[PDB]
């Protein structure tokens, strides 16, 4: 019986959001008790999955930085399977993994980013749902800078792009054309999440992906194409299906200093 008060204490970061209306916590540095959490999840023997996609140019410029740092910082102290989806199984490096880590590489027709939603679901059903309790999907052009632990585990986990204080939903770059499924009306929405990271339990992540791919399809099948590809649909999704856990910007930062705990370099 894990109480939100066993590992989380919102009063540790007053200047930021730590609780969303639907009572879901917003994880920022110093608000989580990872030691408590490691004790907890260890008694259940959980395994965390991470699916990264690298195609063409990305494999040479990023796949390795990802895996290397993911190995040193991702869910350390827990079994973790790394799911590598690439278009060319030979350009992909094989770094040495540490205790409790393993990978599984798959070849994918480099037929786009939106089409990734489909493959991700296909595998959750095919095998991921059986091998891990939670799953995180990330952009390859990222680098972990510090421990990204179980304090990020959740049923439905979303990444905040940024934050301020009451932000006016009108200035979020949601999809505004009503002909799109990613459509979010002005003066509405809670936060603007990054597609660069998002996770949850295989079942939940299958709904996230299955839901987006369908929406992406509709717009594909209507000549329209949502503003920020995946990010549009994904932000439309956490609007209808409020995530159960939100990670602060300190878990997918664009720049490089402060306490990032993971950085999005996105093509240098």
Q: What is the CA radius of gyration of the chain?
A: 18
**Distance of alpha carbon 146 from alpha carbon 227, whole angstroms:** 32
Q: What is the DSSP string of 250-265?
A: GGSBSS--S--SSEE-
Active site residue 96: no
**Minimal CA–CA distance to 142: which of 66, 221, 82?**
66
Peptide-bond breaks in the chain following residues (C–N over 2.5 A): 111
Method used to obtain the model:
X-ray
Cβ-based neighbours of 30, under 8 Å, separated by 6 or more: 12, 13
Between β-strands 142-143 and 263-264, what pairing exists: parallel, antiparallel or unpaired?
antiparallel
Task: Report whether 18 belongs to an annotated binding site.
Answer: no
Task: Report whether 162 belongs to an annotated binding site.
Answer: yes
Task: Report whether 54 belongs to an annotated binding site.
Answer: yes
Of 65, 151, 175, 231, the catalytic one is: 231
**Distance of alpha carbon 142 from alpha carbon 86, whole angstroms:** 16
Task: Report whether 164 belongs to an annotated binding site.
Answer: yes
Own/partner pairs, 1-8, CB within 8 angstroms, 24+ separation = 2/40, 6/33, 6/36, 6/40, 7/32, 7/33, 7/34, 7/36, 7/37, 7/40, 7/151, 8/32, 8/33
Q: Per the structure, how many domains does the chain have?
A: 1
Residue 251's domain comprises: 1-268
| 195 contacts 216 by C-beta, under 8 angstroms | no
In the numeric block, the tokens 């204080």 are attached to: 165
Q: Any bridge partners for residue 197, and if so which?
A: 138
Task: Residue 169: give its domain's CATH number.
Answer: 3.90.550.10
**Which resolution, in Å, applies to this structure?**
2.8
173 token code pair: 């770059």
């Amino acid at each position: 019986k894990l109480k939100l008060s066993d590992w989380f204490n919102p009063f540790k970061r007053p200047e930021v959001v730590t609780m969303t209306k639907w009572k879901a916590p917003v994880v920022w540095e110093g608000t989580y008790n990872r030691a408590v959490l490691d004790n907890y999840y260890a008694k259940q023997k959980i395994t965390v999955g991470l699916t990264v996609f690298a195609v063409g140019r990305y494999i040479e410029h990023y796949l390795e930085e990802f895996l290397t740092s993911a190995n040193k910082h991702f869910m350390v102290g827990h079994p973790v399977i790394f799911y590598i989806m690439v278009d060319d199984v030979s350009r992909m490096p094989l770094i040495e993994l540490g205790p409790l880590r393993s990978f599984k590489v798959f070849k994918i027709k480099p037929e786009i980013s939106m089409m990734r939603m489909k493959t991700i679901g296909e595998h959750i059903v095919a095998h991921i749902q059986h091998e891990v309790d939670f799953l995180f999907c990330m952009d390859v052009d990222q680098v972990f800078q510090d421990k990204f632990g179980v304090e990020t585990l959740g049923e439905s986990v979303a990444q905040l792009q940024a934050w301020w204080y009451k932000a006016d939903p009108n200035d979020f770059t949601y999809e505004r054309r009503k002909e799109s499924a990613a459509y979010i009306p002005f003066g509405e929405g809670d936060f603007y999440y990054r597609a660069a990271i998002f996770g949850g339990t295989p079942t939940q992540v299958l709904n996230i992906t299955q839901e987006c791919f369908k929406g992406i399809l509709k717009d594909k099948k209507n000549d329209i194409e949502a503003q920020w590809h995946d990010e549009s649909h994904l932000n439309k999704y956490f609007l209808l299906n409020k995530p159960t856990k939100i990670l602060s910007p300190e878990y997918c930062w664009d720049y490089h200093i402060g306490l990032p705990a993971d950085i999005k370099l996105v093509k240098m």
